[PDB]
Write a protein that binds this ligand. Structure first.
Ligand SMILES: *[C]C(*)(*)(*)([C@@](*)(*)*)C(*)(*)([C](*)C(*)(*)(O*)C(*)(*)([N@](*)(*)C(*)(*)(*)(=O(*)*)[C@](*)(*)*)C(*)(*)(*)C1(*)(*)[C](*)[C](*)[C][C](*)[C]1*)C(*)(*)(*)(=O(*)*)[N@@](*)(*)[C@@](*)([C](*)[C]C([N])=O)C(=O)[N][C]([C][C][C][N]C([N])=[N])C([N])=O
Lengths: 99, 99
């Protein structure tokens, strides 16, 4: 998939038995998904963005299928407005910018 | 060019006769630069990102060079922690997301 940027690059992901839509964000180092039910252990972490800082729970090694591709990594669950797939998973599915 | 996501996608821009580095960001609908000296009339505006909302100054018809590519668009200037090039200019230098 070559995705053009006239529309938000939004993709289907499958995480925790759940179907979600997530924004692909090259400006996000990490993956932060809207508040949700996930099995396991997690650690308190704080991340920053344009508005300021948020408190998120960090889950390591969670399986995500992103546009039909699989990846395992740290997933952060928290008060984000949209689900964001960031560069930690995006390098895992071979994703590059091109111009 | 083809940019991998192992490191932040940072680029050199010349905006208003000044050289700066900015992040290529697909989760950014707009372009927002740290406070700088830009000539012109601007409208007040507010954007939201991850830990909230910021108040920016909107400048329309700003000329900006990204890697030698010239582009003319709207640029929001305000307290962003990093210079961000969003999809309003990314579609102008023809940039895509491939995976
Ligand atoms: C880079 C930038 C800042 C980004 C941004 C994004 O893109 C957003 N957008 C806006 O804002 C426009 C996203 C979303 C979209 C939709 C709506 C909501 C929002 C960011 O912010 N990023 C962040 C996230 C990721 C993670 N967390 O990982 C980040 O990256 N953060 C970080 C910090 C940075 C800074 N750096 C230095 N300064 N060094 C953390 N760590 O957290």
């Amino acid at each position: 998939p070559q995705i053009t940027l006239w529309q938000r690059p939004l993709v289907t992901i499958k995480i925790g038995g759940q179907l979600k839509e997530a924004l692909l964000d090259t400006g996000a180092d990490d993956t932060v998904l809207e508040e949700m039910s996930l099995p396991g252990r997690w650690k308190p972490k704080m991340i920053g963005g344009i508005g300021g800082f948020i408190k998120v729970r960090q889950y390591d090694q969670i399986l995500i299928e992103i546009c039909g591709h699989k990846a395992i990594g740290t997933v952060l669950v928290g008060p984000t407005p949209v689900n964001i797939i960031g560069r930690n998973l995006l390098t895992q599915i071979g994703c590059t910018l091109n111009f």
